[PDB]
């Protein structure tokens, strides 16, 4: 689970889900990547599930990078309660993903096994994603 050591403000407005990726649209760590073609909120559990999928498929070879960190706290209203009486406490940690953001990087592994591992990892994310490489 990725949870920040501490955050300045535990109750924050919802991150904007508008616009293409501000940065991190090009591979910078690995030789292959998962690039998000859709925006959304990527929770820490989805990140962990994708990481487990990639790491278990690729076994012992190469390294996996998580380019996105879930440091945005999303609050939850008290259950079965009416509206008002303040904001809820944080329940989920998310990363704000925009189309064109490289989510995961993979290296030290040939292209077919990399493709299969990243297919497995992509089937865990809530948005659409694609396999990218460094022009071969």
């Amino acid at each position: 689970m990725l949870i920040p050591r501490r955050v300045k403000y535990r109750k924050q407005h919802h991150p904007k889900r508008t616009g293409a990726a501000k940065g991190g649209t090009q591979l910078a760590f690995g030789d292959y990547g998962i690039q998000a073609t859709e925006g959304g909120y990527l929770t820490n559990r989805q990140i962990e599930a994708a990481r487990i999928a990639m790491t278990r498929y690729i076994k012992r070879g190469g390294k996996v990078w998580i380019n996105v960190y879930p440091d945005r706290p999303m609050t939850k209203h008290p259950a079965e309660s009416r509206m008002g009486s303040g904001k809820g406490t944080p329940e989920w940690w998310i990363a704000n993903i925009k189309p064109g953001r490289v989510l995961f990087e993979l290296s030290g592994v040939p292209e077919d096994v990399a493709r299969e591992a990243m297919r497995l990892a992509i089937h865990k994310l809530p948005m659409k994603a694609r396999f990218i490489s460094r022009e071969g």
Partner: protein
């Protein structure tokens, strides 16, 4: 090799004009250099795509009225999701003059099965010549393991291509598997 690209003059500027140009299967480009003002041209989209398939290619821009001009594509604005080239910066070059470029990196070594090698950079700064642009620079790491590191100061560089960037940073790293 020199790739010849047909270009024609660009006189409408703005997001709307660029949108129309890209809807007409073309690419906006600006060509700037040392002894002339920037020249705004538009290029064939597919020909530019094929020419920019390679990195650091020597282009000959052909404008009907004017003479041919030698150039290197310095900045290529591509679409992030699709692959289409959106804008080309063309730095004009002289035949008898050096050029600074970014040459590519790859690993072709084969270490012990447990340990794996990594590349820590994308492209590296190199001063070279026009008719000799190296395709890539190879670093072969075969049987080198543990905490060995490779910096940019000792690489088998080709002739005519000196080294410009800081030689005090690593480009390749071999290490144990991921634990």
């Amino acid at each position: 090799d020199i790739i010849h690209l047909k270009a024609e003059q660009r006189t409408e500027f703005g997001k709307g004009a660029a949108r129309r140009i890209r809807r007409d299967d073309k690419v906006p480009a600006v060509m700037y250099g040392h002894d002339h003002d920037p020249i705004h041209v538009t290029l064939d989209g597919h020909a530019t795509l094929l020419a920019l398939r390679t990195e650091n290619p020597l282009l000959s821009i052909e404008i009907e009225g004017q003479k041919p001009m030698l150039a290197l594509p310095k900045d290529v604005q591509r679409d992030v999701l699709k692959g289409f080239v959106r804008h080309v910066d063309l730095l004009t070059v002289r035949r008898g003059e050096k050029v600074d470029v970014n040459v590519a990196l790859r690993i072709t070594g084969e270490s012990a099965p447990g340990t794996i090698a990594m590349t820590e950079f994308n492209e590296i700064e190199v001063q070279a010549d026009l008719l000799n642009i190296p395709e890539v620079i190879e670093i072969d790491v075969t049987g080198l393991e543990a905490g060995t590191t490779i910096y940019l100061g000792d690489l088998k560089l080709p002739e005519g291509t000196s080294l410009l960037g800081d030689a005090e940073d690593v480009a390749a790293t071999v290490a144990f598997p991921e634990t």
